[PDB]
Amino acid sequence: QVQLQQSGTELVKSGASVKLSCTASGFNIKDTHMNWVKQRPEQGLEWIGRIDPANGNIQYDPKFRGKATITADTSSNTAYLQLSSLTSEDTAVYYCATKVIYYQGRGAMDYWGQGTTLTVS
Amino acid sequence: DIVLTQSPASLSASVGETVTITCRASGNIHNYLAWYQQKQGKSPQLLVYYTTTLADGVPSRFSGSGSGTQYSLKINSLQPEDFGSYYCQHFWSTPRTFGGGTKLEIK
Amino acid sequence: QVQLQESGPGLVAPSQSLSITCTVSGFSLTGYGVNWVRQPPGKGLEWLGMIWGDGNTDYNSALKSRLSISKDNSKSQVFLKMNSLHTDDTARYYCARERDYRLDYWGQGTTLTVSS
Amino acid sequence: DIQLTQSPSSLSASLGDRVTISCRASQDISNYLNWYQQKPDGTVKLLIYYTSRLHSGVPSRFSGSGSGTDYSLTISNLEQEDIATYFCQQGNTLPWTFGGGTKLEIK
Ligand SMILES: [Zn+2]
Ligand SMILES: [Zn+2]
Ligand SMILES: [Zn+2]
């Protein structure tokens, strides 16, 4: 059954680094694009970037280049998001999402993880 | 709908040579451009997609380039099996459209 | 194993309707689209329409009145229907899989001749 | 980058009501507009995509419309399970962008 299983180091300290994961199930990631999306407390959602595991293409919102690194292990059907220099600004919830059905149009994301909260201290 | 204009219609060349084929959109198709090779009475075969990415198995001697309304395919050091017709096709909006093609023939 | 194969009637008379099937294997029709493309004798590739993984269709604006594409998700088949055929509709017809915005697998095509 | 303005930012209505949320793009997005619902537990789902295509498992009481720069989501017969925050997202040009969200409360 299609599902994204999300977890990673929640409570971190300033200037640290953290690597969050998103394990897929029900489908093989080499077949989709994995997206990482953040949500600051009481704020709107922001798309951080995505990866195509089948070809290594990684696209970032220019404001996260250098801050964020998307990585995928097809071996384990798992995608990752490493975050560096954890400033207070990075305290948010992080989701991963993908599109399984080839919908008409472009940009839709039908399966989302449940989110990983990160508290920089 | 966006239209693809391919230059040149025909290209006579000899092995060893590096040729360049071009495709110009009628609007920004934002890198949603693919290139195909069709050899004599066969199905077109995908070479490059997303403007620059190589289809698994295609010799690195092919390289795709472009942005905006201006794209191109470069074949460095033609091998004899490179000769055929080439086509570009965008995936930016429907109707998807094809370029008129370039018939690459041996000089 | 990815395979797509078209079946057609080979020869039809003008005005008749036409149906060509595309049987696919090796993948599901909900994670991809199938595009219909044709090639008139001595001409380039001409796009006809596509059917998305979700069932929606998009046609070539100029043929749209005479064109119809549907698909049977269970039989693994996609169908192209054309009405009021013209002698200039003579062409080799292909179906091709659309994956992440490129036509990665094509069929071998089927030659349709509109006679009289 | 393409900016999406969503309004209202918050609201209250009652069971059975009909509410309408607006989303407006900094530029034409040619219908590449999708709507998401984020329940209070953090869960997120795709309601509508490509302006008006209803995602399966989603009630017809949710409807989508728009064109060019202005799009809207209409929920008729407000139900309790609708207490959520709705976000719109354009899928026209990278990077994808979302609206600020509309928090819905049943009075
Ligand atoms: Zn991709
Ligand atoms: Zn005609
Ligand atoms: Zn901007």
Terminal alpha carbon distance of chain B: 36
Residues of D in contact with A100 (CB under 8 A): none
| Contacts with A104 from chain C: Cβ below 8 Å | 52, 54, 56, 58
Q: What is the CATH number of the domain that holds C50?
A: 2.60.40.10
D102 closest CA partner among D15, D35, D26, D33? D35
In DSSP terms, which residues pair with D12 in a beta bridge?
D105
Residue A73 CA to residue C67 CA, distance in Å, equals: 43
C50: left (phi over 0), alpha (psi -120 to 50) or beta: beta
Count of CB atoms situated within 10 Å of the CB of C26 = 11
Find out whether B36 and B47 touch, Cβ atoms under 8 Å.
yes
Cβ-contact D54, D47 below 8 angstroms: yes
Vertex B40: Cα angle to B38 and B43 (nearest 5): 45
Show the tokens assigned to C55: 């069932």
Domain ranges of chain A: 1-121
d(CA D35, CA D64): 8
Q: What approach was used to elucidate this structure?
A: X-ray
At the topology level of CATH, where does A1-121 sit?
A: Immunoglobulin-like (2.60.40)
**CB–CB of D98 and A44 under 8 A?**
yes
One-character DSSP codes across C6-66? EE--SEE-TT--EEEEEEEESS-TTS-EEEEEEE-TTS--EEEEEE-TTS-EEE-TTTTTT
* Cα–Cα distances in angstroms (integers) from residue C101 to residues A104, B30, B102, C60, C98, in the given order: 11, 12, 22, 17, 6
Q: How many CA atoms does the CB half-sphere of C61 hold within 13 Å? A: 8
Pairwise CB contact (< 8 Å): C54 & A100: no
Phi, psi at residue A76, to the nearest 5°? -100, 5
Whole-angstrom distance, CA of residue A97 vs CA of residue A90? 19
CA nearest neighbour of D53 among D36, D65, D39: D65
CA distance to A41, A86, D44, per residue, from A119 (Å): 11, 9, 21
Mark out chain C residues that contact chain B at CB-CB < 8 A: 35, 37, 44-47, 50, 58-61, 94, 98, 101-104, 106-109
Does a cis peptide bond (omega within 30 degrees of 0) precede residue D40? no
Type of residue found at A11: L
Helices H, strands E: what count in chain A?
Answer: 0, 11
Minimum Cα–Cα distance from C58: chain A residue: A104
DSSP state, residue B98: B
B1-107: CATH, from 3.40.50.720, 3.30.70.20, 3.30.60.50, 2.60.40.10: 2.60.40.10
Q: Ligand 2 centroid to C82 CA: how many Å? A: 12
Judge whether B93 is closer than 8 Å to chain A, CB to CB. Answer: no
Distances (CA, A) of B9 to B12, C109, D98: 10, 24, 44
Calculate the alpha carbon distances from B22 to B15, B34, B39, C37 in Å: 20, 12, 19, 22
Partners of B53 on chain A (C-beta within 8 Å) are 55, 57
d(CA B61, CA B19): 11
Residues of B in contact with A58 (CB under 8 A): none
Q: Which helix (H) or strand (E) holds A12?
A: strand A11-12
Residue with tokens 């292990």: A73
For residue D88, give both structure tokens: 């719109």
Question: According to CATH, what is the number of the domain D1-107?
Answer: 2.60.40.10
Distance CA C44, CA B14 (A): 24
Q: Which residues of B73-101 are buried (b: 16+ CB within 10 A; e: fewer)?
A: bebeebeeebbbbbbbbbbbbbbbbbbbb
Domain spans of chain B, in order of start:
1-107
Q: Total structural domains in chain C?
A: 1
Whether D25 and D4 have beta carbons less than 8 Å apart is answered as: yes
Q: Rounded to whole angstroms, how far apart are CA atoms C60 and A67?
A: 44
CA A121 from centre of chain: 21
| Calpha distance D104→C100 (Å, rounded) | 35
Q: Which residues of D19-57 are buried (b: 16+ CB within 10 A; e: fewer)?
A: bebbbbbeeebbbbbbbbbbeeeeebbbbbbbbebbbee
Cα–Cα distance, D49 to D56 (Å, whole number): 11
Task: Give the strand pairing for C67-72 and C77-82.
Answer: antiparallel
C 59-88 residues with CB below 8 A of A? none
Contact A31 C31 (CB under 8 A): yes
> Is the CA virtual torsion A74, B34, C64, C12 positive or negative?
negative
Q: Hey, how many other C-beta atoms are within 10 angstroms of the C-beta on C70?
A: 12
Q: Is the dihedral of CA B31, B37, B43, B47 positive or negative?
A: negative
Q: How far is the CA of A108 from the centre of ligand 3 (A)?
A: 20
